């Protein structure tokens, strides 16, 4: 149905704007991008930079991943990000979310030859 590097695209890759446009950018991508289909995802994070950028953070800073695994990467630079966090207002499948635009480091989880993104740990 979809490998691991291309759900990784697929949740967390907006190549095609340089921020969230609008407070109704997460209630618009997490419904457009199916994380809202069976239930609400209620944390995602979409990453405003090239493919490339975020798998080339899969070579920089090597950082202990959420769940004890040892292959996570936080990006050496900032990266135009969205935060998208369920409200309280929101109920399936009236999925609801606060827009959050700002600039942070990335950490991604990467596996696999060719070595890539597999999951997004968090922002700092
Ligand atoms: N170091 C690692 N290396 C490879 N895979 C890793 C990993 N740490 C976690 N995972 C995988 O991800 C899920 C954990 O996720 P968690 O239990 O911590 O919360 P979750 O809501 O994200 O649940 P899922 O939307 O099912 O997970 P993903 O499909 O991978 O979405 P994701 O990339 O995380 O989106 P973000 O919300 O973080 O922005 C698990 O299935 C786990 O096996
Ligand atoms: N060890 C390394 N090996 C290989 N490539 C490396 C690297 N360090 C950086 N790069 C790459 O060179 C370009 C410039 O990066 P650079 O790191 O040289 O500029 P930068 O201005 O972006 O850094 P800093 O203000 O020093 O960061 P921090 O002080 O830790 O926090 P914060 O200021 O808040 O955030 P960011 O400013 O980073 O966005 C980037 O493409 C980066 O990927």
């Given at each position: 149905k979809e490998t691991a590097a291309a759900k990784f695209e697929r949740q967390?890759?907006?190549?095609?704007?340089?921020?969230?446009?609008?407070?109704?950018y997460c209630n618009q991508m997490m419904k457009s991008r199916n994380?809202?289909?069976?239930?609400?995802?209620p944390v995602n994070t979409f990453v405003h930079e090239s493919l490339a950028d975020v798998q080339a953070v899969c070579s920089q800073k090597n950082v202990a991943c959420k769940?004890?695994?040892?292959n996570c990467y936080q990006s050496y630079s900032t990266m135009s990000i969205t935060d998208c966090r369920e409200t309280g207002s929101s109920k399936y499948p009236n999925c609801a979310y606060k827009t959050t635009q700002a600039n942070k480091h990335i950490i991604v989880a990467c596996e696999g030859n060719p070595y890539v993104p597999v999951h997004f740990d968090a922002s700092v």
């Open positions: 967390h890759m907006d190549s095609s704007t340089s921020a969230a446009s609008s407070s109704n994380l809202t289909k069976d239930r609400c995802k769940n004890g695994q040892t």
